[PDB]
Ligand binder design. Structure first.
Ligand code: UPG
Ligand code: UPG
Ligand code: UPG
Ligand code: UDP
Ligand code: MG
Ligand code: MG
Ligand code: MG
Ligand code: MG
Lengths: 306, 305, 312, 305
């Protein structure tokens, strides 16, 4: 069988093949376990596939997944995990920014009785205040969104057990927020503190933030249609107050004060409509993601359902 | 073959395992029917899983379903029912608030030919009047929402036949209102009255909102109806004001086009919202993917796969 | 094999069972084909199921589909068609509103090469003015929606070939307008004319609220034309608001601000309303796309093949 | 093993079958490969089916797909491609605007290594100002939405590898814009130039909107952003009127709270519409059910089921 599966998404990653493979063989032979290296070429434009082919010729542990197009790092990672058959699957980066020597340590934490072992950086390490505070705010928001409290400073370097991988493959979602989905499974999780070696705008970021906020939970859709419906009721109210202030207290003010009532009433009514729609939209969202109701960790006395 | 399946959602249920299992075994012994007890551990931080393991090692009727995390009582019950293989499935609470001896009566009713046998509280005694009013009103609203009239004062303590369990498992809804869903699967249903031995208010709101919105389109159909009525009234009165400006030349304030624009735009946007809501309700009904019908019996035909 | 299936939805049809079955055996026997009679008990509260059991035990051509609840006539028909294994399936009503003898003519048309044969009533003769005109208008509107232009004065009494039954079973949609669905799956279609007997031409009170519900279901559950006429009649309004809001802006800049202290109000109203109307139109277009995706009808329906095998 | 699948959608294509098949044979026989013609009769209201039947009886290479009714040219092409079992699929027209000789050239490019070989006309020539400029603008707007830059002046004459055909069949979309779908499933594409040899609003507008909307979320994402800026400006400017009315009072005539109410409610409704649009786009992405990735080649691994 295959015990470990190192998944490497690669796009324009030539000139890094030799050093990365040397480090991986250096750190994976002391483990004395049967491993595999699933390298997912994400439509590289340079001579990366040629060197990947040569490496796969030389070594029987490298397996290449060649995507038709450049789908992206997240999608290439998803393909690699889908084609990984090891008991533990470790996504790693091809630029070696996250050290591979920590893979060993990750394996140990996986053998302590854990299922997800995140690799959390010591501290931002670079990324001036402008980024640390934004990361803090986003992490607090998402931690309030979920009920599992994924660790801060988590990236795409991690260890997932076969249970975790099977659970992730059990979610048929196209709008994916990986951190939220990894929290949403909630197995025996942990994190290993690693320090990145001493060696993005707000257009690629803001889009990622919106994808995390909207494609994971209904909380933006629930907080709204709750702020609306606080107003609207406060607009239908005071619209009635204006009705009962013109009916008593004869209207000696400007002759078209009733316009205000209209501006409130329809508006408030419209908001209610929106709220209702939003609620149902959220329900439809939950229905179209088709998430499983539950995930089973272990069974005693029962075989697993098909 | 297992005849009865007692499904218990467990969460921090230590200091209750020995007593609950003792009462359940005492009740189920005189039945003389092959039974199984499925304990669904709902991601408890407490040590109930270890004692569940001990009991499963001691008693061969105990089967444990360990969930990945805490999913809630509803989802834990759904998992336990999905793993249950008995002909009749009885959800029950580990706290033993619901008397397990009532299981006797339940199975007796199941022997009369009733597919669903609810267990309903004889009364709630001199309880808080606010609950006595709110629960009654919510039950009346739900009863108007369905056409089957599910009994009131009913919790998760029920007996479901294998046909009812299979029908429920045929509903792939991820947004579930179990009371309305059990009404929707309209097999032969009855109830047994029991007296219990002598609230978040946020869950009480979220569950009510689920019951209103996660089951039917009736709230969405009474709206886009009232909204359409209000929009039509707005359009009619805007037309009246247009005619009032056109005939009699009303211009006293000297700007009676703001109100016409307000009414016309509000009515048009309200009709647009009503059409969008109608189509969104169709989308919701289609994504819920409920089966069109449900066959309770067949004569001369074999069941379709 | 089973040449013909007779699907009868049933709800409190006690005391109608004997005459219905007598007429059915009267008409179906001379056809000298192998037939089955699928009686769909739609949760009847009367003693219908017991007499159904008696007939099934004494007659081998009766099969019973007992529905758990009362799902309605349309869903009972869907269940019966789902359980019907005949090459041709004929829905029919248990109250003998439609003469079963006409079944014979239907079968004849079925042997002429037609895949759907409708049973069309020649005249209404039970609806003085309002119902016939409203039905004509509704049929014209739904035919404008549909392609094959399903004939009018028609009901659930019909015949479908096994190809048509399988094609209808190929649509996994829950919000169904079967009148339009039978036209969307176009196949060699025809219609035979029949006259309702004078014994059953009474007023048949037309519950107007149920009529309205059926009309809304048919209009809003078969096509997106209500959502496409709007998002066009609403986008025109939005455009004509943004314009003339710009015109008010240029008029106030050019012709002065003689307004009493307003026209910021009117420009704001027009601009916000038009922007929200564009937003509602975009939401409507994408919701129509979501609706079409969610319905998940097959792209095409192959009638016959030559040189190729059918796709599983 | 069929090396080539020609797909001809026909609707009322009588008096042109013999010429079409003569040209197809004169083009395909020199290729010296096993070819297979599939005639998709798109519910013709004509006697073309009889001629197709006689041709199929006489010649073995011709097979027929008869649709229930007239579905459209795109749907007929999809039906023919679904039934096509060749290693390469070449959708061609029965009218023969596209020269079948280019099939040769297309096949040649297919043997160079490319997976999709488009057949693009060099220039419109006859179209002077309106049609060519509007086509250029449409392609320019579409290109930003698409991931791979499709070539200009393209049509439905192309060669698609079995790998590309399988990838396309993996997309279960009911609202299909094939020009963008072929770009989304990017592979080794290319194009071959050729000459075609010497516009109602209810199609050239419906198709354009279908491509704009039914393919990508870009129109919905460009809005709900601009609308959000408009909402933010409305709310900020309403706050400005509030701060202007609490300072120095209200020198404007005393009915200027109407502006505040209008701006605030419009901004709140615009935020609601923006949230609804964002979640509707998420639902659209979920329901289009496009696969996350597409695998072109594998080394050391077997293709997943
Ligand atoms: O997350 C979980 C998972 C499982 N269970 C199981 O559910 C069973 C019964 O639920 P329980 O919470 O013990 O019922 P009560 O506490 O007696 O009453 C509930 O019913 C009230 C009605 O408003 C609610 O306010 C609260 O959920 C709660 O007080 C028990 O065996 C538990 O083991 C939970 O309660 N919570
Ligand atoms: O819930 C159900 C299930 C099945 N059937 C069966 O349907 C058959 C005939 O249906 P029916 O509705 O009685 O047709 P008609 O009598 O010709 O016309 C009715 O069609 C209207 C539907 O809009 C009804 O409201 C009116 O009672 C009546 O005009 C009968 O065998 C019934 O048993 C029902 O009627 N209701
Ligand atoms: O409803 C259908 C079903 C199938 N086909 C088949 O499609 C093939 C080619 O169709 P064709 O009409 O020739 O496409 P074009 O070459 O692009 O020409 C058309 O291009 C536009 C229609 O898309 C129109 O504006 C033009 O008048 C018309 O010549 C033929 O085998 C037809 O039989 C149709 O044309 N219409
Ligand atoms: O479109 C892609 C597909 C994959 N990768 C891979 O993603 C990993 C990290 O590269 P990145 O540019 O994302 O650096 P980071 O943002 O993590 O600092 C590397 O293994 C790359 O090979 C990438 O960078 N772009
Ligand atoms: Mg990097
Ligand atoms: Mg309790
Ligand atoms: Mg009747
Ligand atoms: Mg042509």
């Amino acid at each position: 069988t295959i015990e470990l599966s190192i998944v490497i998404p690669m796009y324009n990653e030539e000139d890094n093949l030799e050093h990365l493979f040397a480090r991986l063989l250096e750190v994976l032979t002391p483990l004395k376990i049967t491993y595999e290296i699933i390298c997912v070429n994400d439509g590289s434009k340079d001579k990366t596939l040629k060197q990947l082919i040569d490496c796969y010729q030389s070594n029987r542990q490298i397996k290449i997944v060649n995507l038709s197009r450049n789908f992206g790092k997240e999608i290439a990672l998803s393909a690699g995990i889908d084609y990984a058959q090891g008991n533990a699957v470790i996504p790693i980066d091809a630029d070696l920014q996250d050290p591979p020597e920590l893979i060993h340590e990750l394996v140990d934490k996986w053998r302590e009785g854990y299922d997800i072992v995140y690799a959390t950086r010591r501290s931002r390490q670079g990324e001036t205040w402008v980024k640390q505070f934004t990361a803090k705010m986003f992490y607090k928001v998402i931690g309030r969104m979920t009920e599992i409290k994924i660790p801060p400073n988590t990236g795409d370097f991690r260890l997932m057990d076969r249970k975790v991988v099977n659970a992730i493959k059990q979610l048929p979602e196209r709008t994916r927020f990986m951190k939220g989905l990894f929290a949403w499974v909630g197995y025996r999780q942990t994190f290993v503190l690693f320090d990145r070696e001493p060696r993005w705008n707000y257009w690629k970021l803001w889009n990622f933030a919106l994808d995390g906020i909207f494609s994971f939970s209904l909380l933006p859709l629930k907080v709204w249609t709750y702020l609306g419906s606080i107003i609207s009721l406060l607009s239908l109210a005071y619209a009635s107050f204006l009705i009962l202030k013109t009916i008593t207290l004869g209207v000696d003010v400007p002759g078209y004060a009733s316009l205000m009532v209209a501006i409130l009433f329809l508006g408030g009514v419209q908001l209610i409509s929106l709220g209702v729609i939003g609620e149902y939209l959220g329900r439809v969202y939950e229905e179209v993601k088709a998430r499983p109701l539950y995930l089973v960790s272990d069974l005693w006395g029962l075989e697993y359902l098909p």
